[PDB]
Write a protein that binds this ligand. Structure first.
Ligand SMILES: COC(=O)N1CCCc2cc(NC(=O)[C@@H]3CC=CC[C@@H]3C(=O)O)ccc21
Ligand code: NA
Ligand code: NA
Ligand code: NA
Ligand code: NA
Lengths: 111, 115
């Protein structure tokens, strides 16, 4: 059931929000104009961020855990792609990806 | 937006994929589709809902299944994503996966910067 999924997945997501500073650039959608990065949507075809994932989860749009996971991977993949390995966002992203693997694994298990 | 005809797309992307494939030994567990019967991990398919591997990606590229670069990148990520999820951070194959990510990132960057 939707709330059953939401209850099982939401802590996963909260684990991502609560990483300071690492989640700071992932909490809103990337604004290429406002960030001065006009080539963003030339490289990143399908953007994803924490606010978007939360809104989908909150509103029943993942019928199955793996679809939720796909959107979290997409968010990491877009950031590793666009950003330099040396950059702040790229390393924040790496941190969040470890936090996410750690939390998502036993949730998939009991689910 | 560069528009890439099918042959251009192949010659822009194919060196990306050869780069992964010659990674020895890191690419070996990635050359063929994970066989959960062979390997005894038949809960692989309970965790990995859409499998992906080098042989599949080469077939999709060889048979015109990609029109733009981001679609081939999606599949490359999907192969890495599956392996990071299923494997433990401590395993040989998970560490293989990240080495392959590093290589793929270096190789595809010039492609992404040209579009
Ligand atoms: C992408 O890989 C995976 O996620 N799995 C899940 C668990 C570990 C795993 C092991 C193998 N076996 C091997 O690598 C074999 C021994 C060492 C060299 C290559 C051999 C081969 O089989 O060619 C294949 C696939 C996966
Ligand atoms: Na990582
Ligand atoms: Na990772
Ligand atoms: Na990586
Ligand atoms: Na990475």
């Amino acid at each position: 059931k939707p709330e059953e999924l939401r209850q099982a997945l939401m802590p996963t997501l909260e684990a991502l929000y609560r990483q300071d500073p690492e989640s700071l650039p992932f909490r809103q959608p990337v604004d290429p104009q406002l960030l001065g990065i006009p080539d963003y949507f030339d490289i990143v075809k399908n953007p994803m961020d924490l606010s978007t994932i939360k809104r989908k989860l909150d509103t029943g749009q993942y019928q199955e855990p793996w679809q939720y996971v796909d959107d979290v991977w997409l968010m990491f993949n877009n950031a590793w792609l666009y950003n330099r390995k040396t950059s702040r966002v790229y390393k924040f992203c790496s941190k969040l990806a470890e936090v996410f693997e750690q939390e998502i694994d036993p949730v998939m298990q009991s689910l």
